[PDB]
Design an enzyme around this catalytic site. Structure first.
Site, PDB file in Angstrom:
ATOM      1  N   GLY A  21       0.796  -1.240   0.000  1.00 13.11           N
ATOM      2  CA  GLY A  21       0.000   0.000   0.000  1.00 13.11           C
ATOM      3  C   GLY A  21       0.823   1.280   0.000  1.00 13.11           C
ATOM      4  O   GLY A  21       2.052   1.225  -0.045  1.00 13.11           O
ATOM      5  N   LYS A  46      10.284  -0.895   2.143  1.00 16.25           N
ATOM      6  CA  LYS A  46       9.878   0.402   1.634  1.00 16.25           C
ATOM      7  C   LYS A  46      10.874   0.876   0.590  1.00 16.25           C
ATOM      8  O   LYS A  46      12.067   0.677   0.730  1.00 16.25           O
ATOM      9  CB  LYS A  46       9.785   1.397   2.771  1.00 16.25           C
ATOM     10  CG  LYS A  46       9.027   2.663   2.453  1.00 16.25           C
ATOM     11  CD  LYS A  46       8.669   3.368   3.761  1.00 16.25           C
ATOM     12  CE  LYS A  46       8.294   4.823   3.534  1.00 16.25           C
ATOM     13  NZ  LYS A  46       8.034   5.501   4.824  1.00 16.25           N
ATOM     14  N   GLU A  94      10.053  -5.209   9.720  1.00 20.30           N
ATOM     15  CA  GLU A  94       9.174  -6.312  10.072  1.00 20.30           C
ATOM     16  C   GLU A  94       7.847  -6.172   9.362  1.00 20.30           C
ATOM     17  O   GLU A  94       7.413  -5.042   9.009  1.00 20.30           O
ATOM     18  CB  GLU A  94       8.950  -6.385  11.577  1.00 20.30           C
ATOM     19  CG  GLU A  94      10.174  -6.856  12.371  1.00 20.30           C
ATOM     20  CD  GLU A  94      10.030  -6.567  13.860  1.00 20.30           C
ATOM     21  OE1 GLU A  94       9.250  -5.672  14.199  1.00 20.30           O
ATOM     22  OE2 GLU A  94      10.677  -7.204  14.713  1.00 20.30           O
ATOM     23  N   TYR A  95       7.231  -7.328   9.113  1.00 23.11           N
ATOM     24  CA  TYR A  95       6.008  -7.403   8.351  1.00 23.11           C
ATOM     25  C   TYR A  95       4.877  -7.789   9.308  1.00 23.11           C
ATOM     26  O   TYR A  95       5.068  -8.650  10.164  1.00 23.11           O
ATOM     27  CB  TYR A  95       6.171  -8.437   7.238  1.00 23.11           C
ATOM     28  CG  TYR A  95       4.874  -8.877   6.574  1.00 23.11           C
ATOM     29  CD1 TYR A  95       4.069  -7.964   5.881  1.00 23.11           C
ATOM     30  CD2 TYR A  95       4.471 -10.206   6.612  1.00 23.11           C
ATOM     31  CE1 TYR A  95       2.884  -8.361   5.261  1.00 23.11           C
ATOM     32  CE2 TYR A  95       3.299 -10.620   5.975  1.00 23.11           C
ATOM     33  CZ  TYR A  95       2.508  -9.690   5.317  1.00 23.11           C
ATOM     34  OH  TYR A  95       1.357 -10.115   4.703  1.00 23.11           O
ATOM     35  N   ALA A  96       3.721  -7.129   9.158  1.00 17.42           N
ATOM     36  CA  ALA A  96       2.517  -7.398   9.967  1.00 17.42           C
ATOM     37  C   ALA A  96       1.390  -7.941   9.106  1.00 17.42           C
ATOM     38  O   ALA A  96       0.718  -7.173   8.391  1.00 17.42           O
ATOM     39  CB  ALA A  96       2.075  -6.118  10.641  1.00 17.42           C
ATOM     40  N   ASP A 152       1.590  11.264  15.537  1.00 13.25           N
ATOM     41  CA  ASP A 152       0.448  10.812  14.762  1.00 13.25           C
ATOM     42  C   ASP A 152      -0.002   9.414  15.201  1.00 13.25           C
ATOM     43  O   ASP A 152      -0.363   8.586  14.385  1.00 13.25           O
ATOM     44  CB  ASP A 152       0.766  10.871  13.271  1.00 13.25           C
ATOM     45  CG  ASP A 152      -0.378  10.379  12.400  1.00 13.25           C
ATOM     46  OD1 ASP A 152      -1.549  10.578  12.760  1.00 13.25           O
ATOM     47  OD2 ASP A 152      -0.102   9.784  11.336  1.00 13.25           O
ATOM     48  N   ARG A 156      -4.739   3.343  13.157  1.00  9.71           N
ATOM     49  CA  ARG A 156      -4.230   3.202  11.801  1.00  9.71           C
ATOM     50  C   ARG A 156      -2.679   3.051  11.785  1.00  9.71           C
ATOM     51  O   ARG A 156      -2.116   2.490  10.853  1.00  9.71           O
ATOM     52  CB  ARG A 156      -4.724   4.393  10.944  1.00  9.71           C
ATOM     53  N   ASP A 170       5.254   3.884  11.962  1.00  8.91           N
ATOM     54  CA  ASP A 170       5.610   5.220  11.526  1.00  8.91           C
ATOM     55  C   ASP A 170       6.028   6.202  12.587  1.00  8.91           C
ATOM     56  O   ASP A 170       5.644   7.320  12.607  1.00  8.91           O
ATOM     57  CB  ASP A 170       4.439   5.776  10.759  1.00  8.91           C
ATOM     58  CG  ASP A 170       4.695   5.845   9.318  1.00  8.91           C
ATOM     59  OD1 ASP A 170       5.006   4.808   8.712  1.00  8.91           O
ATOM     60  OD2 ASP A 170       4.597   6.947   8.770  1.00  8.91           O
TER      61      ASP A 170
HETATM   62  C1  LIG Z   1       8.108   1.727  11.539  1.00  9.07           C
HETATM   63  O1  LIG Z   1       7.462   2.464  10.507  1.00  9.07           O
HETATM   64  C2  LIG Z   1       7.569   1.848   9.312  1.00  9.07           C
HETATM   65  C3  LIG Z   1       8.656   2.012   8.478  1.00  9.07           C
HETATM   66  C4  LIG Z   1       8.662   1.342   7.269  1.00  9.07           C
HETATM   67  O2  LIG Z   1       9.655   1.432   6.361  1.00  9.07           O
HETATM   68  C5  LIG Z   1      10.872   2.001   6.811  1.00  9.07           C
HETATM   69  C6  LIG Z   1       7.602   0.523   6.888  1.00  9.07           C
HETATM   70 CL1  LIG Z   1       7.743  -0.224   5.430  1.00  9.07          CL
HETATM   71  C7  LIG Z   1       6.519   0.393   7.751  1.00  9.07           C
HETATM   72  N1  LIG Z   1       5.378  -0.480   7.430  1.00  9.07           N
HETATM   73  C8  LIG Z   1       5.787  -1.887   7.399  1.00  9.07           C
HETATM   74  C9  LIG Z   1       4.642  -2.668   7.211  1.00  9.07           C
HETATM   75  C10 LIG Z   1       4.637  -3.939   7.750  1.00  9.07           C
HETATM   76  N2  LIG Z   1       3.536  -4.719   7.584  1.00  9.07           N
HETATM   77  C11 LIG Z   1       2.483  -4.242   6.891  1.00  9.07           C
HETATM   78  N3  LIG Z   1       1.352  -5.114   6.745  1.00  9.07           N
HETATM   79  C12 LIG Z   1       0.269  -4.540   5.938  1.00  9.07           C
HETATM   80  C13 LIG Z   1      -0.641  -5.715   5.452  1.00  9.07           C
HETATM   81  C14 LIG Z   1      -0.546  -3.603   6.835  1.00  9.07           C
HETATM   82  N4  LIG Z   1       2.486  -3.000   6.373  1.00  9.07           N
HETATM   83  C15 LIG Z   1       3.518  -2.173   6.542  1.00  9.07           C
HETATM   84  N5  LIG Z   1       3.542  -0.907   6.008  1.00  9.07           N
HETATM   85  C16 LIG Z   1       2.251  -0.238   5.569  1.00  9.07           C
HETATM   86  C17 LIG Z   1       1.799  -0.969   4.349  1.00  9.07           C
HETATM   87  C18 LIG Z   1       0.460  -0.408   4.160  1.00  9.07           C
HETATM   88  N6  LIG Z   1      -0.109  -0.367   5.546  1.00  9.07           N
HETATM   89  C19 LIG Z   1      -1.442  -0.475   5.836  1.00  9.07           C
HETATM   90  O3  LIG Z   1      -1.873  -0.477   6.985  1.00  9.07           O
HETATM   91  C20 LIG Z   1      -2.434  -0.668   4.654  1.00  9.07           C
HETATM   92  C21 LIG Z   1      -3.965  -0.806   4.858  1.00  9.07           C
HETATM   93  C22 LIG Z   1      -4.914  -0.966   3.647  1.00  9.07           C
HETATM   94  N7  LIG Z   1      -5.545  -2.338   3.744  1.00  9.07           N
HETATM   95  C23 LIG Z   1      -6.798  -2.455   2.947  1.00  9.07           C
HETATM   96  C24 LIG Z   1      -4.628  -3.465   3.422  1.00  9.07           C
HETATM   97  C25 LIG Z   1       1.047  -0.274   6.508  1.00  9.07           C
HETATM   98  C26 LIG Z   1       4.482  -0.063   6.512  1.00  9.07           C
HETATM   99  O4  LIG Z   1       4.524   1.101   6.132  1.00  9.07           O
HETATM  100  C27 LIG Z   1       6.518   1.049   8.940  1.00  9.07           C
HETATM  101 CL2  LIG Z   1       5.127   0.757   9.853  1.00  9.07          CL
END
Ligand SMILES: COc1cc(OC)c(Cl)c(N2Cc3cnc(NC(C)C)nc3N([C@H]3CCN(C(=O)/C=C/CN(C)C)C3)C2=O)c1Cl
Length: 276
Positions: A21, A46, A94-96, A152, A156, A170
């Site tokens: 996303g 990212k 890390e992935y969620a 923030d 979400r 974030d």
């Molecule tokens: C610590 O802050 C971050 C830094 C960073 O890169 C340096 C990343 Cl990539 C993230 N995350 C990691 C991440 C891990 N796992 C997920 N699982 C998804 C399925 C939620 N997403 C991560 N993302 C974003 C990807 C889009 N995100 C959503 O919540 C999307 C929601 C829309 N739904 C209909 C799926 C969060 C992020 O932006 C976060 Cl949270």
């Protein structure tokens, strides 16, 4: 973009999967651990969008660098590595798999506030809800102890892993979550993060409801100054509503700390029935 061997991972150790996303993709990392070199770990990566200014790049870099300094905690999304050499900057975290907290909760609403999800999941117990709030508090307690002001915090921006671990997202660089002194005066502090956490608690116990429903932005401004506060959620204890109210103290010095909240949530968790 100079190399940092504490975090570098060769590009070819990473099979890039589907979008999540700039933008974020699911991926598989090979040998993320030096002592487990033939293991694949699912991760989020990212990278920059295909059109992206010099600021975009420097913000990504700052975020990564900021993540390095903050260090590790189970209740935040942690940095795992980076690809800085053989082309486009990738930042690996890390992935969620279970989504951000708002969708996670919304999907767990009883089936008849509606359940938006076409893949509904099992409802959460009382104890599970309080435990969710506790973990988020711990994540924020950790960040606070590292002098990081989130700015923030909202459901979400909490993500849930395969094992239902809550991880602040974030934290490294919407009005309905801002404290008045932040809203009005651009004054952001650990105390204003605490106010946001009051709202996040409300999000929790409404299973991902929208705060101040039907209140336009223009209004909200006045109403807060007027000392207006959200009503208790229908299915929330009085103890946990006073906690919200305290997070929403007009005087920011009189809000509890995340440290304090962790201690209270810890106690409330242990007293909350696992039958409910
Ligand atoms: C610590 O802050 C971050 C830094 C960073 O890169 C340096 C990343 Cl990539 C993230 N995350 C990691 C991440 C891990 N796992 C997920 N699982 C998804 C399925 C939620 N997403 C991560 N993302 C974003 C990807 C889009 N995100 C959503 O919540 C999307 C929601 C829309 N739904 C209909 C799926 C969060 C992020 O932006 C976060 Cl949270």
């Amino acid at each position: 973009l100079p190399e940092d061997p504490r975090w570098e991972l060769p590009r070819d150790r990473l099979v890039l999967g589907k979008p999540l996303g700039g933008q974020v993709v699911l991926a598989e990392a090979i040998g993320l651990d030096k002592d487990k070199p033939n293991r694949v770990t699912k991760v989020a990566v990212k990278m920059l969008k295909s059109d992206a200014t010099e600021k975009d790049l420097s913000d990504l870099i700052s975020e990564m660098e900021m993540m390095k300094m903050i260090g590790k905690h189970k209740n935040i999304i942690n940095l795992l590595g980076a690809c800085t050499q053989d082309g486009p900057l990738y930042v690996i975290v890390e992935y969620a798999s279970k989504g951000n907290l708002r969708e996670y909760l919304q999907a767990r609403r009883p089936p008849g506030s509606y359940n938006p999800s076409h893949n509904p999941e099992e409802q959460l117990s009382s104890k599970d809800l309080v435990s969710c709030a506790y973990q988020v508090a711990r994540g924020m307690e950790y960040l606070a102890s590292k002098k990081c002001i989130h700015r923030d915090l909202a459901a979400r921006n909490v993500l849930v892993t395969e094992d239902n671990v809550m991880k602040i997202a974030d934290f490294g660089l919407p009005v309905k979550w801002m404290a008045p002194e932040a809203l009005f005066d651009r004054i952001y502090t650990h105390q204003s993060d605490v106010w946001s956490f009051g709202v996040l608690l409300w999000e929790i116990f409404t299973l991902g409801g929208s705060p101040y429903p039907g209140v336009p932005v223009e209004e909200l401004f006045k109403l807060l100054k007027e000392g207006h506060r959200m009503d208790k959620p229908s299915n929330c204890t009085n103890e946990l509503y006073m906690m919200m109210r305290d997070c929403w103290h007009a005087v920011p010095s009189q809000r509890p700390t995340f440290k304090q909240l962790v201690e209270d949530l810890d106690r409330i968790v242990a007293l909350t029935s696992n039958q409910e």
